[PDB]
């Protein structure tokens, strides 16, 4: 058995990394109460949302 | 004089006084938005304890 | 009436959604200038069209 | 997983701070009954409102 | 005088009173690092006995 590397441990962390990243964006949306908080979540949606907020005011 | 007093007071109230029905709406929006982030605040605090095992 | 007629003209000219004129005749059937399609499917052609007629005086 | 900084808790508290701010401004209008209480809520409105209060008295 | 008391108390509060929500963030963050250090402190004491064989 190879002891120099642990490809199982390498895989487990890379999976755990993206789950942590996806967990954080869930805390953002729930704490702020909005689906879009930064650019990139929905670029066209944020552009449409702001023009609607423009008219609402 | 009493007529213009009624009109001016009506015009004044339309800019200065608040709509209590509309104001409770925005007040209730923020109060729930407060509880949301507070509950999600405790989630983010407990988040990092996972790797301590 | 001259006041009421102009407001009806005003409504048709100033009715908009997301910077698109709605009541001026853009989405009619006879002589439309644009087509309103609600793409409500996950595939290429799964769309349906909407007609709104001119509503000025 | 980074344990030194909690960027999730940073975002959660930061939004909480702006919500408590807007909440306090709503208590002002509810407790006093007036839409404008301090300057900045509506500078031009407060100007016209006081000129009307001048005429009313 | 009441108006001045309110504004004065506000500015004093914005300087002296703590933001309990932001203060809990650091308390939980520093509490975790203590556990991380205590765990890695125990590892270093066990590191010695490797060559006693």
> In Å, how far is A44's CA from the nearest CA of chain D?
23
This structure's resolution (Å) is 2.7
Residue D33's region, left for phi above 0, alpha for psi from -120 to 50, else beta, is left
Cβ contact (<8 Å) for D4 and E36?
no
Q: Is the CB of residue E39 less than 8 Å away from at least one CB of chain B?
A: yes
Let me know if chains B and A touch, i.e. at least 3 Cβ pairs under 8 angstroms. Answer: yes
* Tokens linked to A54: 């423009």
Q: Angle at CA C53, nearest 5°, toward C49 and C55?
A: 150
CA pair distance A31, B15, nearest whole angstrom: 34
Asked whether the beta carbons of D15 and A37 are under 8 A apart, the reply is no
Asked whether the beta carbons of B33 and A29 are under 8 A apart, the reply is no
CA pair distance E43, E23, nearest whole angstrom: 31
Helix axes A7-32, B20-46, angle to 10 degrees: 160
| Residues contacting C21, CB < 8 A, separation 6+ | C13, C15
Closest by Cα among C12, E33, D14, B8 to A37: D14
Q: Which of B38, B41, B49 sits opposite E32 (nearest CB)?
A: B49
- The residues that bridge with D10 in the sheet, in sequence order, are none
CA pair distance C11, C33, nearest whole angstrom: 19
Kindly identify which residue of chain A lies nearest to residue C19, measuring between CA atoms: A51
Closest by Cα among D35, D30, D31, D57 to D46: D35
CA pair distance E44, B46, nearest whole angstrom: 27
Closest by Cα among B40, E21, B15 to D52: B15
Q: Which of B45, B48, B52 sits opposite E24 (nearest CB)?
A: B45
Closest by Cα among A23, A52, A49 to A35: A49
């Amino acid at each position: 058995m190879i002891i120099n590397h642990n490809v199982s441990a390498i895989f487990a962390h890379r999976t755990l990394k993206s789950n942590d990243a996806n967990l954080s964006k869930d805390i953002e949306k729930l704490s702020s109460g909005m689906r879009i908080n930064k650019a990139g979540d929905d670029a066209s949606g944020l552009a449409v949302s702001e023009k609607m907020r423009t008219q609402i005011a | 004089l009493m007529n213009a007093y009624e009109n001016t007071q009506a015009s004044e109230s339309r800019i200065r006084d608040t709509d209590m029905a509309e104001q409770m709406t925005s007040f209730t929006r923020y109060q729930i938005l407060t509880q949301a982030a507070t509950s999600m605040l405790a989630q983010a605090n407990m988040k990092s304890q996972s790797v301590m095992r | 009436v001259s006041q009421l007629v102009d407001e009806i003209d005003r409504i048709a000219s100033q009715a908009e959604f997301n910077k698109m004129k709605l009541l001026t005749g853009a989405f009619a059937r006879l002589n439309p200038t644009a087509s309103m399609w609600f793409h409500i499917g996950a595939n290429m052609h799964q769309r349906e069209r909407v007609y709104i007629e001119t509503m000025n005086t």
